[PDB]
């Protein structure tokens, strides 16, 4: 599974939320729904990763797997598959 | 559509295309505004827009992709890249980025990048792993750039004469000393066309500082490669910005193992602009020249090197003398002993009105054994020994007389042998 | 009857008009009040009244139509135009508007525009679809303005000498190096006379900065084209705004495929005014002049070009040297090599009373091949070869006495041979 | 035959009325009075057009096909012959 860069708007919104520390509402590609906080946007082995923690879980995921993200103060943005 | 082609179309076609899509009274403002309006109208339809540009990173941290058709002039059509994306891909100034753009949202004025799919003519991932320019070890030039076309035309003669006077290799550092009337512009145009013909793989950029608009237009028409220029009516900050954009683009291209050539007209006006913009350090030399100011043009000139790894950066910059201003004389005295190649033009030769007006006895190259072969080097030494006694006007007239019937340099050497 | 017709009408005929039309009071010396009353009465009769003016767009947003008769001076008789009409018809500074004019209402010191019927000698529909000036591609001057008249008098001697020394073409950026006393005004006057006589189609404009009213009046009387000037008593802002007026009008005229000629006496005074008006940028270069002060004079000078699409702009500027102020010298130094044609005036020849006092060895054009033919170029080559090695004042005596008994430059060229 | 542009005075009055965004009284050829607002004057093909949303019809009319307009805030205007 080769990784493709996400659109600039999605990454910019994610970085803004990360440095502003919002309780991000996340939905996975497989459909997993989770309320947690993104601590830092870190890229390892040329594929951009993201660490999201809820009660210290600090689980790692690829940015391609995230389809949409929402918060009360910002609109729900759906990433572009192409 | 693609933004680059839109920038390449003439103004009347732009007006027709805009009126086709419903824009009104767009024939009476800036071309950049026309492009911005038609791009916004097209993006309102929901189609994707493709665009490219060279990245300039401002002092705040965000960057702007500027186009080279407007000589990197700031305009509404410049693309905006946030600092988050400059952090994502390790982008430096001078990077040529191509990708998709999105229309500005509420509260935004400039178009914003949407997805990067080419960085410096390569993949976004691969261009991240390129070594920086100054980490590369410089070397003496050894790959000769031959200016002789060999078609036997009267335009080739100048190139041939130049090849006999001061050969150029890849990564050279040349200085063309130019009195006012002598045909410096003709020499630059001949060099540019010879580079475009003989060596198409080398990236060629022509930089003009404080040039008249008609000269800029005729150079953009004549030169096959890249021409960016700043007219004399523009402020000094414009000249400085265009020079730094050119040099960073060249450095980024060389980092990818590419030959780059920069023809500069002229280093004197660039130094004057840098003196104007740079604040005084308190130590003002003669002619109003500030010692701190000359530091940056010296960096521009010294960036020319032959990288030990693949690649090279040649810079051939002209310098004006006998201009009646102490500023130019001081700049010449500063820059005199810094060039690998030195080519002198003579006012009194052009007084007789024979071309090219090149001073043979005072023009040469440093470590010219590396560029040329042993036989050609010994032939050049023999010719230099023959030429030396004669005066410059007589030298040029005799050289041109002997260079007429011969078609190539080897035939000329053979004719001189007997 | 038109507003300008009553404006340039002197006292007797306007008084007769008032008394035959039925004006109650005719013992008022102030013409503004009687014009206002007579226009009010024309409005009351329902008879339409027309007018003409030149647009000025103030930074606040509305426009004022000034008049060229008062050298584009602000006054109560200027025609007010609201921003709505500026938004309807794409009109910027320099446009000339003629059409219906509405009398001022309660709350208007100035007459309000009613209906436009002509813009730039063109219908508004066709005037709204002309490309902007800086979108046009500059070019070298290819068609020359022959100033050699058939009069054969002593006035034609200066014109013939100027034709021989340095040809002038439409779209040429000119510069006149001159000492404080060289008879420059006579040279400018005869140049303007030749331009008006030989090329009536070309719009001739003469602008003076910081001049005494007497020569302003004599120029307005003796020059066939428009003459605009600013007296020395007026501040620098007046000169700045009048130069902006003339340059914007020239640009708007050029946009309509018209050849516009501007004589500028002098660039030194305009640069002085611009230096004095611009706020300081915090850094002052040698001579007490600001670095950014010269930027706007440079923009004014650089607007001269030969547009490829159609039309031309020929700016011929005079420069003053050795005036005793080093700021004038540095102004000339940053205005040194930006002009296509140059003409140097020598103080010594002026002292010797030789008219004209031009310098053959220090004058000439950048591209004589485009303007002239082949045989003309060779004859000029021969003349330059003859004159250059020897002196200049005696060369001028030679030139004037050689043009003495001859009438046509071709006959003189024949005589100078053998 | 020929199309003449309307005078600047009435045009600037009507655009001022549009800017003030007040209530508007409109009349038809038969003299029917309606309460609505003229949104904006659109300049297409060098010709001014006015769209009306009085009853949602969004009907388009040409600027030379209206005799005159009157408003309560300002004085009623009369279109001059020249």
Numbering used by the authors:
A (entry chain b), D (entry chain a): 3 to 84
B (entry chain B), C (entry chain A): 1 to 418
Paper text:
Bacterial transcription termination factor, ρ, is a hexameric, NTP-dependent 5’–3’ RNA translocase and helicase. A ρ monomer contains N-terminal (NTD) and C-terminal (CTD) domains connected by a flexible linker. The CTDs jointly form a secondary RNA-binding site (SBS) at the center of the ρ hexamer.
We subjected SEC fractions corresponding to ρ-Rof complexes to cryoEM/SPA in the absence and presence of the transition state analog, ADP-BeF3. The reconstructions do not reveal differences in the ρ-Rof interfaces, irrespective of oligomeric state or bound nucleotide. The local resolutions of the reconstructions decrease towards the regions corresponding to terminal ρ subunits and bound Rof. Rof molecules are bound between protomers ρA-ρB, ρB-ρC, etc., but not preceding or following the terminal ρ subunits, ρA and ρF.
